[PDB]
A paper describes a structure:
We thus co-crystallized CrArl13B·GppNHp and CrArl3·GDP in the presence of alkaline phosphatase in order to allow formation of nucleotide free CrArl3. Although crystallization was done in the presence of alkaline phosphatase GppNHp was clearly visible in both active sites, suggesting that the structure represents the post-nucleotide-exchange state. The structure shows indeed that a major part of the interaction is mediated by switch I and II of CrArl13B which contact CrArl3 via α4Arl3, β6Arl3, and α5Arl3 located opposite to the nucleotide binding site. In the crystal structure the nucleotide binding site of CrArl3 is not directly contacted by CrArl13B. We were not able to trap the interacting residues presumably due to the presence of nucleotide and/or the flexibility of the interacting residues of Arl13B. Switch I mutant CrArl13BF53A showed a markedly decreased GEF activity whereas the D46A, F51A, N75A, and Y83A mutants had only a minor effect. The charge-reversal mutations K210E/R216E in α6Arl13B as well as D103R and D146R in CrArl3 show no activity, as expected, whereas a control mutation H154W outside the interface has no effect. In support of their importance residues 212–228 are highly conserved among species and we would speculate that these residues contact Arl3 close to the nucleotide binding site.
As most small G-proteins Arl3 cycles between inactive GDP-bound and active GTP-bound forms and in the latter it binds specifically to effectors.
Author numbering:
A (entry chain B): 17 to 220
B (entry chain A): 16 to 179
Amino acid sequence: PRKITIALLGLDNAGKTTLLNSIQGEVDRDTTPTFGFNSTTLNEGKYKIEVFDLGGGKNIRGVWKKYLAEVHAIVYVVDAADPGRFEESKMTMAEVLENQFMRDKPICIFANKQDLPTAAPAAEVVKGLGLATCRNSHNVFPCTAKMPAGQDVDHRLRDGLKWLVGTVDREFGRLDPRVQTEAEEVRQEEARKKKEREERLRKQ
Amino acid sequence: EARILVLGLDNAGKTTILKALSEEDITTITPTQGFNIKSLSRDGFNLKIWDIGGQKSIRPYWRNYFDQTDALIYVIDSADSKRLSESEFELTELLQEEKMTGVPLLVFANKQDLVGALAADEIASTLDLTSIRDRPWQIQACSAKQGTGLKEGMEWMMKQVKLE
Ligand SMILES: Nc1nc2c(ncn2[C@@H]2O[C@H](COP(=O)(O)OP(=O)(O)NP(=O)(O)O)[C@@H](O)[C@H]2O)c(=O)[nH]1
Ligand SMILES: Nc1nc2c(ncn2[C@@H]2O[C@H](COP(=O)(O)OP(=O)(O)NP(=O)(O)O)[C@@H](O)[C@H]2O)c(=O)[nH]1
Ligand SMILES: [Mg+2]
Ligand SMILES: [Mg+2]
């Protein structure tokens, strides 16, 4: 069984953590903002998926870059019901895709909060994120991460995961050795300039 | 009952936080010696906290209070420049500790009310938090002096505790 690594990105309040709970069937959990790291393992088909749940607030989202070398793909979540933020999300997503370690990796976009009256169609999200000129394979799934109490989770959550897995899968041959390598590189520089920082208060 | 460990460099603001969460007066606070028990009732749990000093001579005695720890709260002076690296080394030593395995980490980035106070994301980098893979962690910017951030930090912590 292959292991792949996925990052949950997208602005704060988009619904990353909630979607992560729902897709596991953990329905009655409520959520607080995320300001750090949180690993979670899922299974889809013949793949075992480790999911980094990260914060997207202004004061923590600059941390994303620290993880990108270790990932095969991104789940990018957008509050489709908050078009006032599409532009911010667009910049933010563009900046991720322009990262060296993001080449050739697919993005699964969730147009979340389709329950809300202001939910923009999956179509307007496309234009809003400038996906036509994007340089990565992508797909968009409208969804409702927070279904009402006593109702099944949105099946479009696993549909999107399935597509992302399928896409990583079709390219697993060149992508995975690339990720194992590049994650090792980043890991060892972060260690070495820690070693410098560490025994540079040997100072006594 | 949850066994909650609260550590950090001396002057980081451990006691001031603990007292603020306890609805007590913080106007005159003293550096801490010995091992003072604090009992917080929160979400139908009873939190057993040792309030401990973070002076260099006290730190080796930290090791004696690690057992069946349900959560680790770590306090940083966000506005104290030169001591940032010293704080990192001590937290690193803690996360290497065996009885800390899989223990949720809450970092209180304290004294956000001070000019020069680092933001969550730079603290996360200077403390090498972004290298962690084996535990869940929050960095919660806060000001014990002004009573901001504390309830939010504990809210996350209590979620991780009640999950287990
Ligand atoms: N109506 C509606 N509300 C939703 C939906 N999904 C999430 N929410 C709400 O949106 C808010 C943010 O959820 P959350 O999962 O914490 O977002 P996040 O992206 O993880 N934020 P952060 O990046 O700060 O951790 C919560 O109040 C949550 O209940 C949805 O599909 N519909
Ligand atoms: N500006 C500011 N000062 C704070 C804040 N919290 C605590 N302090 C101050 O920082 C100093 C040290 O606080 P203290 O609570 O003793 O820290 P400590 O970690 O308990 N020290 P020790 O390890 O020696 O017991 C005191 O002057 C305290 O009032 C805060 O949020 N803002
Ligand atoms: Mg979240
Ligand atoms: Mg003290």
